[PDB]
Every structure is written in C-alpha cells, then in structure tokens.
Homo-oligomer: A and B are copies of this chain.
Amino acid sequence: ARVREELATALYQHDAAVRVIARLTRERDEAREALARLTVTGAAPAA
C-alpha cells in the first residue's frame, strides 16, 4: 500500500515535471529563435 501511494505521488510529480519541461522547452525554443532571427538595425547616433 505504501509503495502504491509512493508510485501515485511519483506519477503525479512526473506529470507535473513533464508539463514544466514542455513549458521550458517552448520558452527555450522561443529564445533561441529570437536570438537566431535577431538582426542589427541601424545604430544611429543620439542627435
């Protein structure tokens, strides 16, 4: 019974970690796409 309860808790933690890992992967992919698509604009002087 204790092992079944621990397995259920570990399954819930694994599902939560899977959701968090998906969110972190989406954020990292967005950041990498922003860095890759970054283009240097005309750095005009402050007149």
Contact = CB atoms under 8 A, between A and B. Distances in A.
Nearest to A10: B10
Interface string A5-47: 0110011011001101100110110011011001000110000
Contact of A25 (B3, B24, B34, B38): B24
Main secondary structure of the interface of A (DSSP, over half): helix
Contacts of A28: 24, 27-28, 31
A20 B38 CA distance: 26
A24 B26 CA distance: 10
Interface of A: 3-4, 6-7, 10-11, 13-14, 17-18, 20-21, 24-25, 27-28, 31-32, 34-35, 38, 42-43
